[PDB]
C-alpha cells in the first residue's frame, strides 16, 4: 500500500529513547538508520511499540550492541523491504555483536534490493537458518550466516498453525508468532504477499493487490505522482533507482549537506560524479571533464587535521581539496616518500597550509602536481602559509622540479634557524606576495642561524675517465683564513636522472640516500681532488663537493660547493650470461635459453656461442652388464654530531694555542663452430643426432666493431634423447639346424646403438614354455656375433629376442619356430 506517513531523514540513535519513538511518525527512512551505543538501557528500561507508518528504509539498517532488545518485533513490526542503497562492509543489513536477542520479530520482510547481510557473533539469536533467500535476494551467496545459535540447531522452533504457507527445522519462519511466506511458481522474485498470491514486477516486497502496478508497497524501478512509473520526466531525477526527485529536492540536499554533497548527472540525483567528469558550477552538472580527472574528495566544513600517516591516506585518488590541511606529522623512516604517495596527486588546495611543530623532514617538497595555492580560507591575521616550532629544515620548494604562485595571504617563517634568508627572499619573489600589494611578516631575526647560506663555486680544472673509475680535480680553493679549511666531504649517489639534487630521497629521521667520502685539505700548488674507489662500468654518478668551515657563536661560513656532474665510466667486458639452459624435447631439437649479463657494461651488441661435437663412449663397448671492502666497516657512513663537535673543538684549540704563542712571541718596536645472437634470450637448433652429447660455450659481448671483448666462458652440456629403433633385433637372425643340437644364433647390430646395448634377452621355449632370460653381453656378442645355444632337446623351439638397451623395452622379436632333431 501507499506510504501513510511523511518521509524523515536518516538518523543515528545512540543513548536515546525519544529518538526510537520518533521512528513511529516516520514512513520512509531517507538515509541510513543506526541503532547503536546503548549502554544505559536494561530489560527494565525498554518497551514494546508498533510503528504503523514506517513501511520502508532507503538505506542499510545497523544494529550495534543495543541493550534491552530481546526480539525484533518491538521496534518495527511492519518493515517489508530494506533496499540498502548505501552499504556498510558490503552488507545492506548489519547486526554486529547483538546479544540478549533471543528471536526476531519481522513479519513482512520479504525482499532486499541490493547489497548483502551480515549475521555473525550472535550466539544467543534464533531463527536464522529457517529463512529462504530465493525470493528476498537473487543469490544464496549474498548473506553471511555464521556464529549463530540457529546454525548449530540448538534453537527451539515454533510457527503458526500445525496457518502459514511456509514449506531443527519444520517450516520457514522467523518467530513463534510470525513466519515466512512461500508462494506458487507463477509468482516472481519481486515479492509475494502473505496471503499466498503473487505480485507484479514493478512492486517490491508484499503488495496489496496481486500483480497490480498501481498498488505496490515499494517500486523497484521508480515511483512518481502516485503510480509506479518506469521513468522520470524532467526535472525529476532518478533517486536511488526507486523514485523521482525534482531539481528542488536535489538542491535542498546539496544545501543541507555542504551525507556527501549531491551531484546531478544521468538525470539522477546521485551522491558523487563518476570519474571522468568535472563539476560544472551553480548547477552541479557533472560535465565530461577534459581527460581523466580523479574524483574530488571534499573536506567536511573545509578542514582536515593530519597528525599521522593514516589520515594522509584519506586523500588517495583526489586532485582538488575543498578546505585547509594541517600537516604536522613527526617520525617514521622515509617520511617524504610516504607523503609523496599519500598526497602527490593533490593538484590544488583551496585552504591554508600549516607546517607548525613539524619534525623528521629536511625539505618541504612532497608534492608533484601543485603549482598554485589558492588560499581561499585565510588564517587569522591574513596568513596563508605557516611554519612554526621547527628545529630542522634544509630547504623549501625548488623552482625547477616544482612551481608555485600565491595570490593571497602573507608569508610566515618563524623559528626556522636553518632556513636561510635567501630561501625566504626567493619565496617572496617567485610567489609574488609583494607583487600583489602585500607585505609579509617574518622572523628573520631567528633565521639563518646554524646553516650555510653563503656559498662559493668550485671549478673543475682536470678530469679523465677510466672503465671503473672517474678522476676529479678542481681549481685550488682556500678560505680567506686557510685555518678554516678542515678538508672536504664529498657526497655521491647513483643517479640516472639529469636534474639530480641533494634532496632526492631521505628527508626523514635516520634515513639517507647519499654516500660520502672524506678527503684531507690540499697540500702546499697541488690541485685537490679525489679518485673514486671503483665503479660500475657504463654507469653515471652524481658528484659534488662541500667544504667544512669554522663556525662562530651564532653562524659563520666560508663554505663552497660543486655543481652536479654526470660522468659515465667507459665500458669493459660483460659478465657471464646468467642461467644457461640448453633443454631438449626431441633428438633433433634443442633450445638454448639464457639471461643477460648480471653486469652488462654497456649495451650488448651480440651474444657469442661455441660448441663441440661428441660421440658415444668407447668404454661402454668394453663393459658388460647383465679489513676489506667485501666485509665492510660502514655501509653508509655519515659523520656524527660528536665527531664534528670534537673536530671543531680541536681545530679551535690548535688555532688558539697558535695565536696565544704568536701574541707573546712577537712585539712591535719600542675446432669448435660458433654463432652470434643479437638481442635474443632464445636459440633454435635442429637437425641433430640422437643420443649425442653437446657441450655449448656461452659468452656475452658488448662491442663488435672496435675489438672483440667478451664475457668469460660459460659451459653447459645437453644430452639428446635416444630414438627407439633398438627395442627389437634389426635385420634377420641367421641360424641353421644341426644334428649336434647347437643353434648358433647370429644377428646384425642395429643401424645405431643409441649409446650402447645393455644386453640381448633370448627366450628358447619348446612348445611355448616359460619365457627365459639370457644375458647376451657386449663382449660375448662381439666374440660370437650374438649368442650360441650349445645343445637343445628335440622339439619345436620358439625363440624370441629383445634388444634390451636404454632405447626402451616392452616388445620381443616374434618367435622363430625350429624343430630341433638329434
Amino acid at each position: 500500500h501507499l506510504y501513510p506517513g511523511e518521509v524523515c531523514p536518516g538518523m543515528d540513535i545512540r543513548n536515546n529513547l525519544t529518538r526510537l519513538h520518533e521512528l513511529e511518525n516516520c514512513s520512509v527512512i531517507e538515509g541510513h538508520l543506526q541503532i547503536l551505543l546503548m549502554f544505559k538501557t536494561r530489560p527494565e528500561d525498554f518497551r514494546d511499540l508498533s510503528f504503523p507508518k514506517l513501511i520502508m528504509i532507503t538505506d542499510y539498517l545497523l544494529l550495534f550492541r543495543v541493550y534491552g532488545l530481546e526480539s525484533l518485533k518491538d521496534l518495527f513490526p511492519n518493515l517489508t523491504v530494506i533496499r540498502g542503497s548505501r552499504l556498510f562492509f558490503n552488507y545492506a543489513l548489519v547486526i554486529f555483536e547483538m546479544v540478549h536477542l533471543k528471536e526476531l520479530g519481522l513479519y513482512n520482510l520479504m525482499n532486499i534490493t541490493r547489497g548483502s547481510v551480515r549475521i555473525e557473533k550472535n550466539n544467543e539469536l534464533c531463527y536464522l537458518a529457517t529463512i529462504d533467500w530465493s525470493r528476498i535476494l537473487d543469490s544464496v551467496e549474498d548473506n553471511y550466516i555464521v556464529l549463530n545459535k540457529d546454525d548449530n540447531e540448538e534453537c527451539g522452533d515454533i510457527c503458526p498453525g500445525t496457518n502459514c504457507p511456509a514449506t531443527q527445522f519444520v517450516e520457514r519462519c522467523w518467530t513463534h508468532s510470525h513466519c515466512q511466506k512461500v508462494c506458487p511458481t507463477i509468482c516472481k522474485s519481486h515479492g509475494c504477499t502473505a496471503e499466498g498470491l503473487c505480485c507484479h514486477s514493478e512492486c517490491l516486497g508484499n503488495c496489496s493487490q496481486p500483480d497490480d502496478p498501481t498498488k505496490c508497497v515499494a517500486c523497484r524501478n521508480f515511483y512518481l505522482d502516485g503510480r509506479c512509473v518506469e521513468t522520470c520526466p524532467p526535472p525529476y531525477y532518478h533517486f536511488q533507482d526507486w523514485r523521482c526527485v525534482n531539481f528542488s529536492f536535489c538542491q535542498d540536499l546539496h544545501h543541507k549537506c555542504k551525507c556527501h554533497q549531491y551531484v546531478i548527472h544521468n538525470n539522477k540525483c546521485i551522491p558523487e560524479c563518476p570519474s571522468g567528469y568535472t563539476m560544472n558550477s551553480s548547477n552541479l552538472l557533472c560535465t565530461p571533464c577534459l581527460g581523466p580527472c580523479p574524483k574530488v574528495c571534499h573536506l567536511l566544513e573545509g578542514e582536515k587535521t593530519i597528525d599521522s600517516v593514516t589520515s594522509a591516506q584519506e586523500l588517495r585518488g583526489c586532485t582538488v581539496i575543498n578546505g585547509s590541511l594541517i600537516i604536522n606529522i613527526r617520525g617514521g623512516n622515509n617520511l617524504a616518500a610516504e607523503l609523496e604517495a599519500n598526497l602527490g596527486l593533490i593538484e590544488e588546495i583551496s585552504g591554508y597550509l600549516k607546517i607548525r611543530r613539524s619534525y623528521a623532514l629536511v625539505s618541504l617538497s612532497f608534492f608533484r602536481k601543485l603549482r598554485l595555492i589558492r588560499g581561499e580560507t585565510l588564517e587569522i591575521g591574513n596568513y596563508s602559509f605557516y611554519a612554526l616550532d621547527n628545529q630542522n629544515l634544509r630547504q623549501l620548494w625548488d623552482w625547477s622540479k616544482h612551481n608555485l604562485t600565491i595570490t593571497q595571504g602573507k608569508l610566515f617563517f618563524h623559528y626556522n634557524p636553518k632556513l636561510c634568508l635567501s630561501e625566504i627572499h626567493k619565496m617572496e619573489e617567485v610567489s609574488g606576495t609583494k607583487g600583489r600589494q602585500e607585505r609579509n611578516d617574518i622572523a628573520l631575526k631567528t633565521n639563518g642561524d646554524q646553516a650555510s647560506c653563503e656559498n662559493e663555486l668550485l671549478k673543475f680544472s682536470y678530469i679523465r675517465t677510466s672503465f671503473d673509475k672517474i678522476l676529479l680535480r678542481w681549481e685550488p680553493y682556500w678560505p680567506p683564513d686557510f685555518r678554516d679549511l678542515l678538508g672536504f666531504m664529498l657526497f655521491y649517489k647513483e643517479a640516472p636522472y639529469q636534474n639530480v639534487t641533494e634532496f632526492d630521497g631521505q628527508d626523514a629521521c635516520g634515513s639517507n640516500s647519499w654516500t660520502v667520502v672524506d678527503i684531507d685539505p690540499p697540500l702546499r700548488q697541488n690541485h685537490p681532488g679525489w679518485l673514486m674507489r671503483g665503479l660500475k662500468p657504463w654507469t653515471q654518478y652524481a658528484i659534488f663537493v662541500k667544504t667544512l668551515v669554522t663556525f662562530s657563536d651564532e653562524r659563520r661560513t666560508y663554505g663552497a660547493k660543486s655543481d652536479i656532474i654526470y660522468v659515465q665510466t667507459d665500458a669493459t667486458n660483460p659478465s657471464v650470461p646468467l642461467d644457461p639452459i640448453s633443454v631438449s624435447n626431441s633428438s633433433s631439437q634443442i633450445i638454448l635459453k639464457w639471461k643477460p649479463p648480471s653486469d652488462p657494461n654497456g649495451n650488448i651488441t651480440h651474444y657469442l656461442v661455441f660448441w663441440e661435437r661428441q660421440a658415444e663412449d668407447s668404454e661402454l663397448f668394453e663393459l658388460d652388464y647383465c679489513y676489506e671492502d667485501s666485509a665492510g666497516e660502514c655501509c653508509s657512513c655519515p659523520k656524527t654530531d660528536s665527531q664534528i663537535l670534537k673536530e671543531l673543538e680541536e681545530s679551535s684549540f690548535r688555532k688558539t694555542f697558535e695565536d696565544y704563542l704568536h701574541n707573546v712571541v712577537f712585539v712591535p718596536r719600542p675446432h669448435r663452430p660458433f654463432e652470434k645472437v643479437v638481442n635474443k634470450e632464445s636459440l633454435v637448433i635442429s637437425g641433430l643426432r640422437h643420443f649425442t652429447g653437446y657441450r655449448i660455450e656461452l659468452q656475452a659481448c658488448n662491442q663488435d666493431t672496435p675489438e672483440e671483448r667478451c664475457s668469460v666462458a660459460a659451459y653447459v652440456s645437453a644430452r639428446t634423447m635416444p630414438e627407439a629403433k633398438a627395442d627389437d633385433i634389426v635385420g634377420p637372425v641367421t641360424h641353421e639346424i644341426f644334428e649336434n643340437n647347437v643353434v648358433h644364433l647370429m644377428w646384425q647390430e642395429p643401424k645405431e646403438p643409441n649409446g650402447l646395448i645393455v644386453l640381448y634377452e633370448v627366450s628358447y621355449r619348446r612348445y611355448g614354455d616359460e619365457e627365459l632370460h639370457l644375458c647376451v653381453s657386449r663382449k660375448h656378442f662381439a666374440l660370437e656375433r650374438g649368442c650360441r645355444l650349445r645343445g637343445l632337446s628335440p622339439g619345436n623351439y620358439s625363440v624370441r629376442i629383445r634388444a634390451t638397451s636404454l632405447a626402451g623395452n616392452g616388445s620381443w622379436t616374434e618367435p622363430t619356430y625350429f624343430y630341433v632333431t638329434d
Binding site: 679523465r464 677510466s466 673509475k469 678522476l471 679518485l531 674507489r533 671503483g534 676489506e628 671492502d629 666497516e633
Partner: peptide, 23 residues
C-alpha cells in the same frame, strides 16, 4: 674503499699521470 694489485696499479696510474710511478 681498499685497493690491491690491479686496482692499486690502476690507481697509481690515474693519480700520477703527469709523472711516472713505481710499485
Amino acid at each position: 674503499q681498499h685497493l690491491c694489485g690491479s686496482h692499486l696499479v690502476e690507481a697509481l696510474y690515474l693519480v700520477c699521470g703527469e709523472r711516472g710511478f713505481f710499485y
